Amino acid sequence: VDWRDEPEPSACEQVSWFPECTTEIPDTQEMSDWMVVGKRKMIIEDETEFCGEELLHSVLQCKSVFDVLDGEEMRRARTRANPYEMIRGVFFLNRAAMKMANMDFVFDRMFTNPRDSYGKPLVKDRELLYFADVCAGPGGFSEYVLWRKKWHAKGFGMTLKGPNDFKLEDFYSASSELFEPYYGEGGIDGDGDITRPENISAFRNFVLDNTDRKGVHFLMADGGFSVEGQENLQEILSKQLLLCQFLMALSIVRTGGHFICKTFDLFTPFSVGLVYLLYCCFERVCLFKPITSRPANSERYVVCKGLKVGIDDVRDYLFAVNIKLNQLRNTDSDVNLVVPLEVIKGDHEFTDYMIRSNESHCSLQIKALAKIHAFVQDTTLSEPRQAEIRKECLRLWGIPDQARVAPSSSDPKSKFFELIQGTEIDIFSYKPTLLTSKTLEKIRPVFDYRCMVSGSEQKFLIGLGKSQIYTWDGRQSDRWIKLDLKTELPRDTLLSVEIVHELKGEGKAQRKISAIHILDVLVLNGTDVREQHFNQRIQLAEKFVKAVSKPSRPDMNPIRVKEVYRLEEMEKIFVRLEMKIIKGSSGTPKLSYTGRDDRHFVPMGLYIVRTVNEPWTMGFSKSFKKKFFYNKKTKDSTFDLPADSIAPFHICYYGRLFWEWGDGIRVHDSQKPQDQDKLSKEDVLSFIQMHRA
């Protein structure tokens, strides 16, 4: 084989896709005879149904050349023959993350910014991006995605426990509450084996429970294991892994969502039928090998965009096939077909593409294998272009050529000063204006304001990564105190929070949990949001906060956003106030605010926050029945949101009022020691009603 007649190395890569599938999705009735069970076959050399005999045999002999060669001596020639070797992982934890860096650029930000078939993005940058990462070597894929999307992505991961488990603490960015691992049945106590039906169903239910029952925007799968001593049978030995990854795609990926999965050789009709099922289920499919995939191996990736509606029959069918596979382990039987060969070959376009892909990959891999062999037989040979190629690839993909090495062992005070970027520190010391009969007129605009129920004193919280979380009470004299709660948060995060005691049940059976309730956000994981509108900051807070949660680890402290109400709708708050018997109140019922779940807390009062800026105010047009913005200086009026009407964080914090709910204040009808000097619920509601018009 002449390996020196290979094309010149290049950072430019071309992609061709399968023809778009026109035939209908197979249903349960049609697939009822598709599964074929026969003798277990551990021979690959005759699988020429989608590849020429010459190419298959040549690639197999080229692989088997190294059956007698030293493994380390072979990998040392591999390092020299591969022109893309020096790329490695750059500043990530492994080279696998740079594979996602490669393919996210090649497929036009398909994963970091997923669109639909019409060109419309699925996630509003100014809603949350949901992704899943199954069969992941310490989540390098997720390291790339999280480093690129910061708090604007939430990831769900499942992988095999053991030496190749997730390494959250080694992510360049991110945290445990950004990429939340779930290991199947038992939650975090599972083994993460994706080939177990219990784990499949459990991870599916988990992902659906944390994605508004819609599913993830995309799923990435990169499963593999050692096939040492029997490398040539790699595709057969990992057939079930491939089937389970395709099935997980059909199980948790939302409609219009995407899916990328690592495969190996695709000579057998079993793997080709699986690819055909993906081609039927997605709007467009292709087989691609990035240059960050070593040229001498059988590794490639199948890229799928636009999951179709009504793929549930295929999902159930593949679940059943996996069960049969589990039942045939250690026997002489095996599932050798999932789609009949006549159906696959009946689609001439699909078969043409499949054969051409197999053969082109075979020729390239044969050249690379002979190249490694030649570099073994001659140790002076080398590619003199690895450095420049790596430089150009990093430039092309937008990956900065800077190492991970920055543990950011910053103290919370210095990091706080870094994150506020010269903003005056006294802004963080302002106390709220107490709401009294003398200050009631301050909330006169009503529409300019939002309100939320408080359960503890307001504090600032900074996240330095993982469990390095510190709080500060806003006074220059106070020290940053490490938070004694089992919770994690990404570095470069700055929050306005309160630490609430949540209660579930009453009396002797009452359980209590401490929780972080977010009031407002300034910086999350590195991008500043302080200048965005308050509702937008709360929505990005729900984005990150939904991301910073823990369903697989019931052992961790929950993080929540406060429920934000419109001031002209404060009446909805009092409907959630109940008198409940709290553990240790000697039987006295205490006022309790019940949240979205079956938990409640003792309220201390109600914050009123202004969301509209200086001489800008919101009125209600009775003719148009819509709210409008009015400029008190220019006298202009508009029904759209003016950019200068936006109240940034410092205005919202400085101008906030607090309506305390201590003794003598009646906000629930069962507690009427109404101190005549203190505002009741009726007084505030009457004032609000008089000034809504």
XYZ file of C-alpha atoms in Angstrom:
693
model
C 0.000 0.000 0.000
C 1.262 3.471 -0.942
C 0.459 5.740 2.000
C 2.504 8.644 0.598
C -0.165 9.194 -2.092
C -2.578 10.481 0.585
C -4.002 14.017 0.332
C -2.102 16.826 2.001
C -3.179 17.454 5.616
C -5.562 20.367 6.000
C -7.861 22.057 8.490
C -10.607 22.242 5.843
C -13.167 19.427 6.023
C -16.060 18.584 3.695
C -19.350 16.966 4.731
C -21.981 15.124 2.688
C -25.259 13.876 4.159
C -27.646 11.020 3.536
C -30.547 11.874 1.228
C -33.475 13.115 3.283
C -35.781 10.227 4.133
C -39.094 10.301 2.254
C -40.657 6.987 3.309
C -42.869 6.865 6.386
C -41.621 5.980 9.866
C -41.939 2.225 10.551
C -44.676 1.370 13.042
C -45.103 -1.561 15.417
C -47.010 -3.589 12.816
C -44.378 -3.248 10.081
C -41.432 -4.000 12.391
C -43.171 -7.035 13.933
C -41.059 -9.349 11.731
C -37.862 -7.277 11.505
C -35.881 -8.816 14.388
C -33.861 -11.855 13.272
C -32.176 -14.108 15.846
C -29.491 -16.578 14.808
C -26.105 -18.058 15.650
C -23.707 -15.721 17.425
C -21.124 -14.641 14.844
C -17.614 -13.617 15.931
C -16.208 -13.367 12.381
C -16.021 -10.081 10.476
C -13.879 -10.865 7.415
C -16.810 -11.767 5.125
C -19.095 -8.807 5.969
C -19.062 -7.330 2.462
C -22.762 -6.452 2.116
C -21.881 -2.731 2.186
C -18.148 -2.762 1.391
C -15.914 -4.250 -1.274
C -14.132 -7.463 -0.331
C -10.730 -5.985 -1.204
C -11.132 -2.973 1.093
C -12.442 -4.971 4.062
C -9.667 -7.560 3.821
C -7.021 -4.868 3.315
C -8.066 -2.877 6.384
C -8.220 -6.082 8.460
C -4.712 -7.190 7.430
C -3.420 -3.651 8.029
C -4.860 -3.799 11.553
C -3.482 -7.302 12.175
C 0.026 -6.158 11.204
C 0.310 -4.855 14.782
C -0.659 -8.197 16.362
C 3.075 -8.895 16.768
C 4.275 -5.282 17.081
C 4.854 -3.699 20.479
C 1.898 -1.598 21.591
C 3.882 1.330 22.981
C 6.291 1.155 20.039
C 3.229 1.313 17.774
C 1.621 4.283 19.542
C 4.931 6.167 19.359
C 4.849 5.832 15.557
C 1.154 6.758 15.648
C 2.055 10.008 17.420
C 4.515 10.818 14.611
C 2.377 9.779 11.625
C -0.786 11.671 12.633
C -0.575 15.330 11.490
C -3.427 16.282 13.863
C -1.862 14.624 16.923
C -0.435 17.732 18.607
C -3.921 19.253 19.003
C -4.688 16.867 21.887
C -7.063 18.356 24.465
C -5.551 21.875 24.620
C -6.995 23.135 27.920
C -9.682 20.461 28.328
C -9.384 17.239 30.322
C -8.887 14.951 27.302
C -8.686 14.997 23.510
C -12.334 13.904 23.236
C -13.500 17.424 24.118
C -11.582 18.758 21.127
C -13.598 16.331 18.987
C -16.746 18.229 19.974
C -14.859 21.491 19.437
C -14.056 20.211 15.928
C -17.552 19.042 15.031
C -19.475 21.946 16.581
C -17.618 24.241 14.191
C -17.919 21.850 11.242
C -21.699 21.513 11.684
C -22.264 25.284 12.129
C -22.822 25.445 15.898
C -25.407 22.666 15.596
C -24.860 21.731 19.253
C -23.992 24.983 21.045
C -26.737 26.858 19.123
C -29.239 24.309 17.781
C -31.685 25.466 15.103
C -34.683 23.795 13.496
C -35.190 22.823 9.850
C -36.383 26.343 8.975
C -33.330 28.119 10.419
C -34.979 29.165 13.706
C -33.015 28.557 16.930
C -34.605 26.317 19.545
C -33.354 28.347 22.543
C -33.661 32.104 23.105
C -30.265 33.434 24.193
C -31.714 36.472 25.957
C -34.696 30.161 27.777
C -32.375 27.328 28.802
C -30.449 24.891 26.589
C -30.881 21.257 27.656
C -28.452 18.539 26.591
C -27.586 14.978 27.562
C -24.213 13.206 27.513
C -24.279 9.405 27.767
C -21.344 6.974 27.756
C -18.901 9.810 28.369
C -15.257 9.521 29.297
C -15.090 12.022 32.165
C -17.522 14.243 30.248
C -15.112 15.960 27.873
C -17.983 16.591 25.461
C -19.858 18.212 28.332
C -16.729 20.145 29.284
C -16.718 21.748 25.831
C -20.465 22.416 25.815
C -20.494 23.861 29.334
C -17.376 25.965 28.738
C -19.041 27.395 25.624
C -22.562 27.923 27.050
C -21.707 28.742 30.724
C -24.922 28.896 32.784
C -26.991 28.989 29.631
C -26.887 25.175 29.370
C -28.003 22.321 31.633
C -26.552 18.849 31.086
C -27.647 15.363 32.138
C -24.961 12.678 32.102
C -24.880 8.907 32.509
C -21.774 6.733 32.248
C -20.287 3.586 33.738
C -19.086 3.907 37.328
C -15.455 3.102 38.078
C -12.094 4.400 36.860
C -13.735 6.052 33.819
C -16.486 7.833 35.758
C -17.306 11.516 35.407
C -14.717 13.946 36.772
C -16.739 17.067 37.555
C -13.942 18.616 39.605
C -11.629 18.603 36.567
C -13.938 20.560 34.252
C -12.276 23.783 33.095
C -15.629 25.471 33.809
C -18.947 24.231 35.160
C -19.937 22.489 38.400
C -21.939 19.585 39.794
C -25.078 21.717 39.404
C -24.465 22.299 35.699
C -23.845 18.759 34.410
C -25.917 16.593 36.675
C -25.019 12.880 36.634
C -27.744 10.239 36.938
C -26.721 6.580 36.971
C -29.980 4.760 36.221
C -32.143 2.893 38.715
C -31.380 4.176 42.194
C -30.384 7.593 40.848
C -26.849 8.489 41.875
C -26.496 5.015 43.425
C -26.892 3.268 40.065
C -24.067 1.785 38.027
C -24.725 3.858 34.895
C -24.876 0.834 32.582
C -26.817 2.150 29.582
C -27.496 -1.424 28.407
C -29.830 -2.104 31.355
C -33.551 -1.465 30.690
C -33.984 -0.236 34.271
C -31.293 2.412 33.791
C -32.722 3.356 30.385
C -36.206 3.986 31.772
C -34.897 5.729 34.899
C -32.608 8.131 33.029
C -35.405 8.831 30.539
C -37.827 9.694 33.351
C -35.173 11.869 35.019
C -34.354 13.815 31.845
C -38.059 14.315 31.114
C -38.738 15.445 34.694
C -36.064 18.135 34.272
C -36.958 19.316 30.734
C -40.650 20.306 31.079
C -41.359 16.741 29.863
C -40.114 17.817 26.413
C -36.637 16.261 26.469
C -33.183 17.581 25.697
C -32.352 19.780 22.722
C -29.595 17.352 21.722
C -27.841 14.203 22.921
C -24.207 13.203 22.458
C -22.966 9.629 22.899
C -19.320 8.537 22.726
C -19.372 5.001 24.093
C -16.453 2.605 23.892
C -14.345 0.119 25.809
C -11.211 -1.982 25.487
C -11.238 -4.662 22.783
C -7.584 -5.573 23.331
C -6.550 -8.869 21.757
C -9.679 -8.957 19.561
C -9.566 -5.494 17.989
C -10.837 -6.653 14.585
C -14.193 -7.659 16.143
C -14.737 -4.219 17.695
C -17.989 -3.491 15.846
C -19.534 -6.820 16.862
C -18.342 -6.626 20.474
C -20.053 -3.226 20.906
C -23.248 -3.787 18.899
C -25.459 -3.541 21.995
C -23.775 -0.320 23.146
C -24.523 1.248 19.756
C -28.139 0.062 19.847
C -28.653 1.426 23.368
C -27.188 4.818 22.445
C -29.465 5.135 19.397
C -32.391 4.081 21.608
C -31.493 6.671 24.258
C -31.560 9.266 21.483
C -35.050 8.120 20.519
C -35.975 8.153 24.232
C -34.910 11.576 25.548
C -34.348 13.827 22.518
C -37.144 16.343 21.964
C -38.930 16.834 18.653
C -36.648 18.695 16.276
C -33.728 17.840 18.538
C -30.310 16.641 17.460
C -28.119 13.639 18.194
C -24.459 12.762 17.600
C -23.102 9.299 18.387
C -19.723 7.639 18.010
C -19.682 4.450 15.970
C -16.983 2.061 14.769
C -16.791 -0.077 11.629
C -20.254 -0.362 10.069
C -19.834 -3.459 7.910
C -22.451 -5.693 9.534
C -26.112 -5.363 8.471
C -26.999 -4.954 12.170
C -25.183 -1.616 12.477
C -26.351 -0.506 9.024
C -29.948 -1.257 9.998
C -29.508 0.820 13.141
C -28.213 3.696 10.993
C -31.225 3.186 8.713
C -33.555 3.506 11.705
C -31.840 6.774 12.639
C -32.206 7.899 9.009
C -35.938 7.167 9.180
C -36.316 8.947 12.536
C -34.365 12.169 11.850
C -34.764 14.779 9.128
C -31.134 14.455 7.986
C -28.298 12.052 8.835
C -24.637 11.794 7.828
C -21.519 9.780 8.660
C -18.508 11.939 9.490
C -14.954 11.467 10.762
C -13.358 14.642 12.169
C -9.622 15.228 11.957
C -9.524 15.000 15.767
C -10.408 11.312 15.297
C -7.176 9.408 14.759
C -6.899 8.469 11.061
C -5.875 4.817 11.564
C -8.841 3.718 13.705
C -12.398 2.721 12.811
C -13.853 5.639 14.783
C -16.441 7.832 13.072
C -19.520 9.785 14.130
C -23.135 9.736 12.959
C -24.741 13.187 13.068
C -28.538 13.499 13.178
C -30.616 16.693 13.145
C -34.365 17.186 13.482
C -36.014 14.289 15.318
C -39.346 13.573 13.636
C -42.759 13.411 15.281
C -44.093 9.928 15.947
C -40.921 7.904 16.501
C -42.370 6.071 19.516
C -42.904 2.741 17.735
C -39.218 2.597 16.767
C -38.332 3.493 20.367
C -40.406 0.627 21.786
C -39.032 -1.762 19.155
C -35.406 -0.963 19.992
C -36.131 -1.278 23.723
C -37.492 -4.784 23.088
C -34.490 -5.694 20.916
C -32.128 -4.609 23.701
C -34.038 -6.807 26.155
C -33.612 -9.798 23.833
C -29.897 -8.971 23.591
C -29.639 -9.077 27.383
C -31.398 -12.460 27.361
C -28.958 -13.955 24.808
C -25.758 -13.076 26.690
C -23.264 -15.942 27.093
C -25.359 -18.087 24.726
C -24.727 -19.227 21.158
C -27.535 -16.962 19.883
C -27.533 -13.266 18.990
C -29.704 -10.636 17.330
C -28.092 -10.366 13.893
C -30.694 -8.180 12.144
C -32.818 -5.243 13.245
C -33.939 -4.193 9.729
C -34.294 -6.769 6.920
C -31.508 -6.589 4.344
C -34.115 -6.324 1.579
C -35.582 -3.173 3.149
C -32.147 -1.552 3.500
C -31.140 -2.439 -0.063
C -34.578 -1.403 -1.333
C -33.555 2.200 -0.660
C -30.968 2.651 -3.407
C -29.965 6.145 -2.250
C -29.334 5.061 1.351
C -27.350 2.005 0.255
C -25.286 4.016 -2.240
C -24.330 6.531 0.447
C -23.598 3.782 2.985
C -21.342 1.812 0.632
C -19.480 4.935 -0.484
C -18.913 6.035 3.124
C -17.636 2.607 4.185
C -15.263 2.423 1.218
C -13.806 5.936 1.471
C -13.231 5.471 5.204
C -11.642 2.081 4.473
C -9.175 3.555 1.976
C -8.185 6.430 4.273
C -7.779 4.073 7.245
C -5.705 1.627 5.176
C -3.349 4.431 4.170
C -3.057 5.604 7.787
C -2.395 2.065 9.061
C 0.324 1.458 6.475
C 1.713 4.872 7.452
C 1.936 3.848 11.117
C 3.609 0.600 10.044
C 6.167 2.514 7.959
C 6.838 4.850 10.894
C 7.474 1.750 13.015
C 9.946 0.351 10.483
C 11.626 3.785 10.225
C 11.855 6.014 13.305
C 13.411 8.992 11.480
C 10.245 9.714 9.473
C 7.949 12.429 10.799
C 5.303 14.948 9.818
C 7.067 18.351 10.001
C 3.719 20.181 9.901
C 1.976 19.158 13.146
C 2.570 22.471 14.941
C 1.267 24.709 12.143
C -1.698 22.403 11.474
C -2.652 22.471 15.159
C -2.344 26.267 15.213
C -4.590 26.644 12.162
C -7.163 24.205 13.562
C -7.380 26.088 16.860
C -7.734 29.380 14.974
C -10.456 27.943 12.725
C -12.522 26.389 15.520
C -12.280 29.396 17.845
C -10.393 27.515 20.575
C -7.940 29.799 22.432
C -4.406 28.392 22.671
C -4.183 28.841 26.441
C -3.782 26.054 28.996
C -6.210 24.985 31.721
C -3.665 25.877 34.356
C -5.438 28.593 36.337
C -6.929 26.958 39.467
C -8.401 30.373 40.347
C -7.471 29.923 43.985
C -8.722 33.466 44.466
C -10.038 34.634 47.795
C -13.722 35.649 47.690
C -12.989 39.352 48.287
C -10.514 39.735 45.418
C -12.802 37.714 43.148
C -15.744 39.914 44.159
C -13.770 43.020 43.217
C -12.826 41.359 39.923
C -16.449 40.483 39.162
C -17.896 43.920 39.965
C -15.419 45.512 37.506
C -15.007 48.802 39.338
C -18.619 49.254 40.433
C -18.816 51.220 43.679
C -18.912 48.827 46.629
C -21.302 51.059 48.591
C -24.065 50.007 46.176
C -23.984 46.600 47.887
C -24.522 48.107 51.367
C -27.878 49.825 50.757
C -30.641 48.744 53.136
C -34.232 48.462 51.869
C -36.752 51.207 52.532
C -39.321 49.947 55.026
C -42.870 50.039 53.685
C -44.994 52.100 56.077
C -47.981 54.416 55.863
C -45.460 57.234 55.353
C -43.632 55.424 52.518
C -46.634 53.804 50.803
C -46.689 56.494 48.103
C -43.303 55.266 46.854
C -44.966 52.260 45.174
C -47.576 54.488 43.509
C -46.746 53.511 39.871
C -47.498 49.856 40.782
C -46.780 48.596 37.257
C -43.140 49.680 37.649
C -42.748 47.174 40.494
C -42.445 43.457 41.187
C -42.702 41.699 44.542
C -41.482 38.506 46.199
C -41.902 36.847 49.594
C -38.809 36.842 51.815
C -37.878 34.114 54.281
C -34.561 35.385 55.636
C -32.225 38.359 55.497
C -30.785 39.200 52.089
C -27.164 38.224 51.421
C -24.698 38.180 48.550
C -23.274 34.853 47.383
C -20.151 34.214 45.298
C -19.239 30.903 43.687
C -15.586 30.043 43.132
C -16.288 26.546 41.780
C -17.666 23.301 43.262
C -18.218 23.642 47.052
C -16.192 26.874 47.358
C -19.248 29.041 48.006
C -19.121 32.142 50.210
C -21.692 34.638 51.488
C -21.461 38.295 52.504
C -23.988 40.540 54.247
C -23.214 43.707 52.267
C -21.252 45.674 54.883
C -17.645 46.632 54.144
C -16.685 45.496 57.652
C -18.083 41.973 57.239
C -15.945 39.040 56.122
C -16.898 36.531 53.451
C -18.197 33.420 55.228
C -17.988 29.961 53.684
C -21.458 28.509 53.143
C -22.046 25.387 55.259
C -24.403 23.694 52.809
C -23.966 20.622 50.591
C -24.244 22.381 47.246
C -22.066 23.269 44.263
C -22.005 26.148 41.784
C -19.761 27.170 38.863
C -16.896 29.633 39.265
C -17.407 33.337 38.446
C -20.968 33.374 39.837
C -22.327 36.336 41.826
C -25.846 36.216 43.268
C -28.248 38.077 45.535
C -29.792 35.375 47.729
C -31.409 34.492 51.030
C -30.885 31.272 52.991
C -34.326 29.805 53.706
C -35.438 26.997 56.032
C -37.889 24.969 53.947
C -40.399 22.787 55.799
C -42.297 19.708 54.609
C -45.123 18.308 56.707
C -46.271 19.603 60.077
C -45.920 18.787 63.746
C -43.705 15.919 64.822
C -43.292 14.548 61.286
C -42.063 17.862 59.859
C -38.825 17.697 57.865
C -36.696 20.827 57.440
C -34.212 21.705 54.707
C -32.003 24.761 54.199
C -32.180 26.164 50.674
C -30.621 28.945 48.628
C -33.393 31.194 47.318
C -32.144 33.562 44.628
C -33.538 37.106 44.701
C -31.525 38.622 41.827
C -28.434 37.856 39.746
C -25.400 39.916 38.695
C -22.844 37.512 37.205
C -23.266 33.808 36.530
C -20.291 31.603 35.523
C -18.598 34.595 33.883
C -21.096 36.569 31.737
C -22.480 39.731 33.286
C -26.260 40.174 33.370
C -26.596 43.128 35.766
C -27.713 45.531 33.021
C -30.525 43.285 31.750
C -34.140 43.843 32.755
C -35.162 42.401 36.119
C -37.578 39.844 34.666
C -34.879 38.819 32.186
C -32.396 38.418 35.036
C -34.963 36.272 36.859
C -35.512 34.177 33.724
C -31.775 33.658 33.265
C -31.758 32.872 36.972
C -34.404 30.202 36.368
C -32.239 29.034 33.474
C -29.079 28.663 35.604
C -31.116 27.675 38.666
C -32.964 24.913 36.903
C -29.429 24.030 35.875
C -28.234 24.452 39.471
C -30.490 21.783 40.949
C -30.117 18.230 42.238
C -32.661 15.461 41.474
C -30.077 12.652 41.305
C -28.453 13.798 44.571
C -31.236 14.232 47.153
C -28.282 14.683 49.523
C -27.550 18.196 48.244
C -28.925 21.599 49.215
C -31.474 22.875 46.666
C -31.117 26.191 44.842
C -34.252 28.052 43.747
C -35.414 31.347 42.256
C -37.954 33.312 44.241
C -41.450 33.469 42.791
C -41.705 36.972 41.307
C -45.156 38.569 41.240
C -46.407 41.683 39.516
C -47.234 44.327 42.112
C -50.734 44.681 40.666
C -51.126 40.948 41.418
C -49.962 40.846 45.055
C -53.379 39.368 45.881
C -52.094 36.031 44.554
C -49.468 35.943 47.321
C -51.928 35.986 50.229
C -53.783 32.993 48.765
C -50.624 30.942 49.431
C -50.340 32.002 53.095
C -51.397 29.306 55.567
C -51.285 28.874 59.346
C -49.321 25.681 59.995
C -48.104 23.934 63.140
C -44.311 24.159 63.075
C -42.041 21.847 65.036
C -41.175 23.645 68.268
C -43.897 26.315 68.239
C -45.528 24.734 71.344
C -48.574 24.058 69.166
C -48.994 27.651 67.965
C -49.735 27.813 64.228
C -47.321 30.105 62.406
C -47.774 31.989 59.148
C -46.309 29.954 56.290
C -45.861 30.607 52.569
C -46.246 27.486 50.424
C -44.187 27.323 47.234
C -44.577 25.492 43.944
C -43.837 22.158 45.648
C -45.278 20.804 48.888
C -42.742 22.757 50.963
C -43.309 25.964 52.936
C -41.310 28.521 54.904
C -41.978 31.200 57.511
C -42.107 34.572 55.722
C -40.358 37.593 57.186
C -41.943 40.046 54.759
C -42.237 41.067 51.124
C -39.668 42.816 48.938
C -40.905 45.395 46.421
C -38.442 45.932 43.566
C -38.654 48.626 40.895
C -38.000 47.348 37.367
C -38.478 50.614 35.415
C -35.820 53.333 35.428
C -35.626 57.044 36.248
C -38.408 59.293 34.793
C -39.671 56.267 32.889
C -42.897 54.649 34.035
C -45.521 52.123 32.975
C -49.164 53.059 32.555
C -52.194 51.123 31.349
C -54.061 52.316 28.260
C -57.799 51.824 28.692
C -58.406 52.321 24.963
C -55.787 49.790 23.822
C -56.108 47.536 26.920
C -52.304 47.248 26.944
C -49.553 48.586 29.178
C -47.347 51.349 27.786
C -44.128 53.118 28.751
C -44.246 56.876 29.369
C -41.236 59.207 29.513
C -41.878 61.900 32.120
C -39.273 64.235 30.588
C -39.960 64.021 26.839
C -43.675 63.084 27.257
C -43.276 60.288 24.690
C -45.302 57.068 24.871
C -44.604 53.638 23.385
C -45.984 50.109 23.663
C -42.523 48.544 23.260
C -39.803 48.336 25.896
C -37.365 51.271 25.728
C -33.745 50.326 26.310
C -33.209 53.255 28.686
C -36.324 52.317 30.690
C -34.563 49.132 31.843
C -33.672 49.138 35.530
C -30.259 47.497 36.010
C -29.267 45.623 39.136
C -27.983 48.640 41.052
C -31.200 50.606 40.488
C -33.336 47.606 41.479
C -31.255 47.001 44.614
C -31.036 50.654 45.674
C -34.729 51.379 45.142
C -36.127 48.244 46.773
C -38.689 48.441 49.574
C -39.379 45.863 52.283
C -42.794 45.285 53.875
C -41.977 43.512 57.139
C -44.441 40.893 58.420
C -43.762 40.901 62.164
C -46.138 40.715 65.102
C -49.227 42.901 64.923
C -49.427 42.820 61.109
C -52.472 41.153 59.546
C -51.847 39.499 56.183
C -53.912 36.342 56.838
C -57.445 36.362 58.209
C -56.612 34.026 61.120
C -54.064 36.468 62.626
C -55.722 39.816 63.429
C -53.702 41.557 66.151
C -53.732 44.449 63.716
C -51.519 47.179 65.125
C -53.207 50.333 63.879
C -49.815 51.905 63.094
C -48.834 49.009 60.789
C -49.966 48.415 57.212
C -52.299 45.466 56.754
C -52.886 43.399 53.634
C -56.137 45.321 53.165
C -54.418 48.726 53.320
C -51.774 47.800 50.744
C -54.298 46.101 48.456
C -56.634 49.112 48.632
C -53.782 51.491 47.810
C -52.740 49.271 44.896
C -56.306 49.071 43.572
C -56.751 52.847 43.747
C -53.545 53.326 41.735
C -54.026 50.640 39.071
C -56.362 52.913 37.098
